[PDB]
Amino acid sequence: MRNQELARIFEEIGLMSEFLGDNPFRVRAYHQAARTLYDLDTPIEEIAEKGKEALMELPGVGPDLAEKILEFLRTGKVRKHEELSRKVPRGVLEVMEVPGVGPKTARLLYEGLGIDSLEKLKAALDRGDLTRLKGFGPKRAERIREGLALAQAAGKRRPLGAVLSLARSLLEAIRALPGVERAELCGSARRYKDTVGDLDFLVASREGERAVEGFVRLPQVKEVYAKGKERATVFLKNGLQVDLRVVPPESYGAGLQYLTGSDAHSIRLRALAQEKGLKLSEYGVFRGEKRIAGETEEEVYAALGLPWIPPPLREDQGEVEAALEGRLPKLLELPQVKGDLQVHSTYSDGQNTLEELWEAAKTMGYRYLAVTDHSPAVRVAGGPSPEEALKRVGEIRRFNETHGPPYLLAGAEVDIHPDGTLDYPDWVLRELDLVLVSVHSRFNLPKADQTKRLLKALENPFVHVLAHPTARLLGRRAPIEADWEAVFQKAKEKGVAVEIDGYYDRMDLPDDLARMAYGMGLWISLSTDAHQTDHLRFMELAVGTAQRAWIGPERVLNTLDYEDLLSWLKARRGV
Ligand SMILES: Nc1nc2c(ncn2[C@H]2C[C@H](O)[C@@H](COP(=O)(O)OP(=O)(O)OP(=O)(O)O)O2)c(=O)[nH]1
Ligand SMILES: [Ca+2]
Ligand SMILES: [Ca+2]
Ligand SMILES: [Ca+2]
Ligand SMILES: [Ca+2]
Ligand SMILES: [Cl-]
Ligand SMILES: [Zn+2]
């Protein structure tokens, strides 16, 4: 559907027209045309095929607008939009939009200040300039800076784990709206993508316009960017940018598929539908005018002749073909994970004592937790020395002797020196239950040298896991350059697992490299890199990554019970 695209063009013409000071009657007309297109559920093209008169049946559309609709559908553009685009630069428009701004304001801003982009705005805000620009006073000094921040974030992505819990708190409030029967967080978040744009929620309601109204008036909502009969876009007080879509209860499952995507997955499904004489839309699966499915997502998949496909797979990367052949991959699920294989303590950089870690693991129903404190080079600090590290192993053994399950594995996160040697001697490594190795320095070695360093680390027969292998930090540090094929192949041959560290700004291995490692036949270790007990919740992110990577419970260390894990760790491994 081109409905939203056309709504935007008309809206922009409205803004640009008012900026230029066109007839306020026309300005309002374009905005009313935009609302109509925003709210219109049936494809505009279907009404345009019926003629100019039929277009004119739509609220707000007269002869002038009906012709612009046809022009857009036939050419892909609207000359009037292109014309005002010649008079109106990009950032000047951007200034007028920045939530809380607008055209006439932006015109004094343009004429008065010389603003046809954004940096200038910022400049004026911080200096107090707008406090002296005619028509730019008090409570609005706040609003404009705030709007600017919202605009600048809308291009950008955040780590899934930075926003998932906040999204779920909004989900609780949405579910609690009177009139909402079901709701779910959809979009890329439901697919466990490691960074997300806006957050998208689907609601089932028999009274959609009233559900939108309750939604936009939630205590959590700061600013409404767009709203209509069945949809809205808002900004929360906490900054989250949120889209809502409402469908009737009979359509909920079709709405879940629609809003979860990916777009590429949905394109595949719509074609499968039409190939068997059906139409898949946000509102259901239809044979002619008859709705044959829609209420649950599994029903929708079934009507297309498919098993239900887990959201993390919905990327058009082989899952449609696997579903068609009745051979979806077996995927790791969160209840199968029996413990977390990288947690830190007060012995190094963690906030928690052994007792606190144990208590948290016990609450979570884990069988074990690996306490993997840093070797001395990781933290750029004197200890824990090799002697101290072994003293700690004894302390953890005594803790297990006095506590029982969940058992603590006495581990270490051992720094890899620039030359590939390890930051504890073998007499320490041999006594640890779990040896992780990782890069914490010299991140920018040439690719071939970084590869040699990692290969040398993998020569050590006491290593169990290559921890957070790329060392990336989302928003702060790029992945290290290394030949991952060479590294993973050596790890496989030596019996070393690779880690999926679900700590929210690490997400390392990333899904794509995890898919490569598992496809090459490696073992996988999941962890949260916890430095406080609140971090243990990130195991869901590591499992979501595993699902995106087509990883099953086979060859995942965390699915082994305690005894089988210890056996694996002690065993002759590799080729
Ligand atoms: N990408 C895309 N998705 C669409 C379109 N029409 C409907 N959808 C569905 C599939 C998307 O997964 C879902 C949410 O759209 P978004 O643009 O928010 O994308 P998504 O949440 O998948 O990714 P994001 O992390 O926001 O970039 O809406 C379209 O034109 N493009
Ligand atoms: Ca009309
Ligand atoms: Ca409710
Ligand atoms: Ca989204
Ligand atoms: Ca969206
Ligand atoms: Cl469902
Ligand atoms: Zn580390």
Side-chain angles (χ1 to χ4, degrees), residues 157 186-189 191 196-200 241 243 259:
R157 307 185 66 82
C186 299
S188 63
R191 310 199 307 275
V196 298
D198 67 16
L199 292 162
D200 306 275
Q241 183 168 330
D243 286 342
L259 199 53

mmCIF file of all heavy atoms in Angstrom, residues 157 186-189 191 196-200 241 243 259, ligand 4:
data_model
loop_
_atom_site.group_PDB
_atom_site.id
_atom_site.type_symbol
_atom_site.label_atom_id
_atom_site.label_comp_id
_atom_site.label_asym_id
_atom_site.label_seq_id
_atom_site.Cartn_x
_atom_site.Cartn_y
_atom_site.Cartn_z
ATOM 1 N N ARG A 157 19.482 3.530 16.253
ATOM 2 C CA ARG A 157 19.057 2.243 16.815
ATOM 3 C C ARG A 157 19.634 2.103 18.218
ATOM 4 O O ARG A 157 20.686 2.671 18.538
ATOM 5 C CB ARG A 157 19.496 1.102 15.901
ATOM 6 C CG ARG A 157 19.033 1.324 14.455
ATOM 7 C CD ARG A 157 19.346 0.167 13.535
ATOM 8 N NE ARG A 157 18.611 -1.060 13.863
ATOM 9 C CZ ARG A 157 17.358 -1.319 13.498
ATOM 10 N NH1 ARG A 157 16.685 -0.473 12.732
ATOM 11 N NH2 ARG A 157 16.814 -2.464 13.851
ATOM 12 N N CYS A 186 5.682 -6.244 19.083
ATOM 13 C CA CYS A 186 5.998 -6.861 17.793
ATOM 14 C C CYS A 186 7.254 -6.231 17.175
ATOM 15 O O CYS A 186 8.211 -5.999 17.901
ATOM 16 C CB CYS A 186 4.775 -6.824 16.870
ATOM 17 S SG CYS A 186 3.338 -7.738 17.519
ATOM 18 N N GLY A 187 7.257 -5.993 15.865
ATOM 19 C CA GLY A 187 8.413 -5.481 15.162
ATOM 20 C C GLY A 187 9.675 -6.294 15.391
ATOM 21 O O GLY A 187 9.660 -7.491 15.744
ATOM 22 N N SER A 188 10.801 -5.625 15.185
ATOM 23 C CA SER A 188 12.100 -6.308 15.299
ATOM 24 C C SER A 188 12.435 -6.771 16.706
ATOM 25 O O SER A 188 13.170 -7.754 16.884
ATOM 26 C CB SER A 188 13.206 -5.424 14.736
ATOM 27 O OG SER A 188 13.266 -4.247 15.523
ATOM 28 N N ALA A 189 11.836 -6.133 17.713
ATOM 29 C CA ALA A 189 12.033 -6.590 19.085
ATOM 30 C C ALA A 189 11.522 -8.022 19.265
ATOM 31 O O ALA A 189 12.144 -8.839 19.941
ATOM 32 C CB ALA A 189 11.327 -5.677 20.081
ATOM 33 N N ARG A 191 11.429 -10.262 17.107
ATOM 34 C CA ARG A 191 12.355 -11.133 16.372
ATOM 35 C C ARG A 191 13.733 -11.233 17.060
ATOM 36 O O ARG A 191 14.600 -11.929 16.562
ATOM 37 C CB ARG A 191 12.511 -10.671 14.922
ATOM 38 C CG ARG A 191 11.185 -10.440 14.195
ATOM 39 C CD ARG A 191 11.336 -10.446 12.673
ATOM 40 N NE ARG A 191 12.380 -9.513 12.233
ATOM 41 C CZ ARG A 191 12.205 -8.211 12.007
ATOM 42 N NH1 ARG A 191 11.023 -7.607 12.176
ATOM 43 N NH2 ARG A 191 13.248 -7.469 11.604
ATOM 44 N N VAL A 196 17.348 -2.182 17.684
ATOM 45 C CA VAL A 196 15.979 -1.904 17.249
ATOM 46 C C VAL A 196 15.801 -0.436 16.925
ATOM 47 O O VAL A 196 16.454 0.437 17.541
ATOM 48 C CB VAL A 196 14.916 -2.360 18.265
ATOM 49 C CG1 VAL A 196 15.017 -3.892 18.440
ATOM 50 C CG2 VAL A 196 15.085 -1.607 19.594
ATOM 51 N N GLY A 197 14.923 -0.155 15.970
ATOM 52 C CA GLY A 197 14.458 1.215 15.745
ATOM 53 C C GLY A 197 13.290 1.483 16.674
ATOM 54 O O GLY A 197 13.359 1.234 17.883
ATOM 55 N N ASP A 198 12.205 1.987 16.115
ATOM 56 C CA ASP A 198 11.039 2.227 16.954
ATOM 57 C C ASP A 198 10.451 0.910 17.482
ATOM 58 O O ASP A 198 10.745 -0.177 16.954
ATOM 59 C CB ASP A 198 9.979 3.097 16.239
ATOM 60 C CG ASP A 198 9.329 2.406 15.057
ATOM 61 O OD1 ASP A 198 9.412 1.182 14.884
ATOM 62 O OD2 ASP A 198 8.678 3.116 14.258
ATOM 63 N N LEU A 199 9.635 1.022 18.534
ATOM 64 C CA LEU A 199 8.953 -0.143 19.103
ATOM 65 C C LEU A 199 7.524 -0.164 18.593
ATOM 66 O O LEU A 199 6.920 0.878 18.462
ATOM 67 C CB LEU A 199 8.958 -0.064 20.627
ATOM 68 C CG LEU A 199 10.374 -0.219 21.217
ATOM 69 C CD1 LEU A 199 10.415 0.276 22.630
ATOM 70 C CD2 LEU A 199 10.904 -1.620 21.092
ATOM 71 N N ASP A 200 7.010 -1.355 18.301
ATOM 72 C CA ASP A 200 5.711 -1.496 17.647
ATOM 73 C C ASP A 200 4.843 -2.425 18.481
ATOM 74 O O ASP A 200 5.274 -3.531 18.815
ATOM 75 C CB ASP A 200 5.928 -2.155 16.278
ATOM 76 C CG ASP A 200 6.940 -1.408 15.468
ATOM 77 O OD1 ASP A 200 6.542 -0.430 14.806
ATOM 78 O OD2 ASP A 200 8.138 -1.783 15.524
ATOM 79 N N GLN A 241 10.260 5.761 21.279
ATOM 80 C CA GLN A 241 9.361 6.081 20.160
ATOM 81 C C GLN A 241 8.549 4.854 19.825
ATOM 82 O O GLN A 241 9.102 3.781 19.599
ATOM 83 C CB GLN A 241 10.168 6.468 18.921
ATOM 84 C CG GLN A 241 9.285 6.877 17.769
ATOM 85 C CD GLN A 241 10.035 7.530 16.653
ATOM 86 O OE1 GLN A 241 11.068 8.188 16.859
ATOM 87 N NE2 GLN A 241 9.506 7.398 15.460
ATOM 88 N N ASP A 243 5.075 2.937 17.958
ATOM 89 C CA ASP A 243 3.939 2.804 17.065
ATOM 90 C C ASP A 243 2.947 1.816 17.682
ATOM 91 O O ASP A 243 3.340 0.774 18.217
ATOM 92 C CB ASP A 243 4.377 2.212 15.730
ATOM 93 C CG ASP A 243 5.130 3.188 14.848
ATOM 94 O OD1 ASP A 243 5.064 4.413 15.049
ATOM 95 O OD2 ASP A 243 5.777 2.693 13.907
ATOM 96 N N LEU A 259 2.652 -7.127 11.957
ATOM 97 C CA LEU A 259 3.460 -6.153 12.679
ATOM 98 C C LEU A 259 4.813 -6.715 13.126
ATOM 99 O O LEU A 259 5.670 -5.955 13.568
ATOM 100 C CB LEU A 259 2.634 -5.577 13.840
ATOM 101 C CG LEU A 259 3.183 -4.257 14.377
ATOM 102 C CD1 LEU A 259 3.381 -3.230 13.317
ATOM 103 C CD2 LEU A 259 2.365 -3.718 15.542
HETATM 104 CA CA CA B 4 10.176 -1.078 14.776
#
